[PDB]
Amino acid sequence: MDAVIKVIGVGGGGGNAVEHMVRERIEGVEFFAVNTDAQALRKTAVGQTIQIGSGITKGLGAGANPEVGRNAADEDRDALRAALEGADMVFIAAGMGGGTGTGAAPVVAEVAKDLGILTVAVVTKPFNFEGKKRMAFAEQGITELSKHVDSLITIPNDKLLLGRGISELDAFGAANDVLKGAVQGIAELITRPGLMNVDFADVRTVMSEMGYAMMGSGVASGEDRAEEAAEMAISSPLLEDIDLSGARGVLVNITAGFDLRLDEFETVGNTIRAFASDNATVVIGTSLDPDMNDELRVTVVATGIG
Ligand SMILES: Nc1nc2c(ncn2[C@@H]2O[C@H](COP(=O)(O)OP(=O)(O)OP(=O)(O)O)[C@@H](O)[C@H]2O)c(=O)[nH]1
C-alpha cells in the first residue's frame, strides 16, 4: 500500500543530478536514468537505466540537437511507459539546453501524464556563458515541457552561482543540491511522514495541473527553530522575486527528528499563512528524519505562480 514515487534523470545533466540524489539519499523513492548515451548508462550508480534510441550517433555533434533526444524518446515510448506504469508520482530532472534532456524530458513527462500520474519537473537553464544557442534550446524545451507536466520548477544556473577552486563539477553541484532539495522536500512528505502526515490528495491538490512553481528552504536550531526555518525559506534567494500570496498553492515540508512538536507545526503554519493568500490552497506536512538532532528544516514550494 506504500506510495510508488519514481525520480527520472534525463540526459547527462539530469543523470548527474539524480546520481547526487542517490548519493545523498531520498527516502522511499525509485531512481531511473534515461539517456541516449549508452556509456553514461553503463557508468551510472542509478539502479535502473533506460536506453532511448539506438545509442549509435549518426553524425558528429548531432546529439546536441533536441530533435535527436525527442526522436530517441519517441522510438522507445513503450519502454518509458512500462517503467512509469503504476507510479503515484513521477519527478523529472533535466539540465535543459543539450540534446537529450531538452528533447526527451517532455516525452517522458507526457508518457507519465497520459498514464494519469502526478508529474513534477525540476529542471535547470544553462549558464549564460554556455552561449545563446543552448539558452534558446533550453527555453524552447521548457515551453514544450510545460505542456506535459503538472508543476514545473525552473532553476536558472545564473541565479544560483564563479571563481578559483570552483570546478565545473562544483558549479553544477549547486544546481544538484537545489534539484535534490525540491524532489526530497515534496516526496518525503509521502514516504517518511512525521507526526502530522500530509494526505497525498492534498499534495495532488496543490501540484496537479498547477503550472509554474518555485522552492525555497531554510534550516535552524535553537528555541525558535520553527519560525526561523520558515522565515529563512520564505526569504531564500529563489523566492525573493515571488510573493507567496500570488501562488494558487503552497506545499510545506517541515523535516526534523523525533522531537518535532505540535506547537512547532502550528508555528510554521502560522508563518506560512501570514505570507500566503486566503484565495489559495495551503498544505503543511512533516517528515521524520531520525538522524536530525536539534535542527529543523522548512521547505516551501509555491505552486500555480504566474
Ligand atoms: N546538474 C548538472 N547539469 C549539467 C551537467 N552537465 C551539464 N549540465 C547542464 O545541463 C545542460 C545539458 O547538458 P547535458 O545534459 O550534458 O546535455 P544532454 O541533455 O545529455 O544532451 P546531449 O549531451 O547534447 O546529448 C548543460 O547545458 C548544462 O547547463 C552536470 O553534470 N550536472
Residue numbers in the entry: 9 to 169, 172 to 316
From the paper:
The GTPase activity of FtsZ is largely dependent on polymerization, as the GTP-binding pocket at the ‘top’ of a subunit must make contact with the catalytic T7 loop residues at the bottom of an adjacent subunit in the protofilament to hydrolyze the bound GTP. Because EcFtsZ(L178E) has been shown to be deficient in GTPase activity owing to its inability to form filaments, we considered that it was likely that it would crystallize with GTP. Crystals were successfully obtained of the EcFtsZ(L178E)–GTP complex that were isomorphous with the EcFtsZ(L178E)–GDP crystals. In spite of evidence that the L178E mutation in EcFtsZ inhibits assembly, the crystals showed that EcFtsZ(L178E) assembled into straight protofilaments, as noted in the previous study of Du et al.. However, comparison of the EcFtsZ(L178E) filament with the SaFtsZ filament reveals that the EcFtsZ filament is much looser (see below for the buried surface areas). Presumably, as the residue corresponding to Leu178 in SaFtsZ is wedged into a hydrophobic pocket of an adjacent subunit in the SaFtsZ filament, the similar burial of the Glu178 side chain into the hydrophobic pocket in the EcFtsZ(L178E) filament is predicted to be unfavorable. As a result, the EcFtsZ(L178E) protofilaments have a more open subunit interface. Our analyses show that the EcFtsZ(L178E) structure adopts the R state and as such has a closed cleft between its N-terminal and C-terminal subdomains.
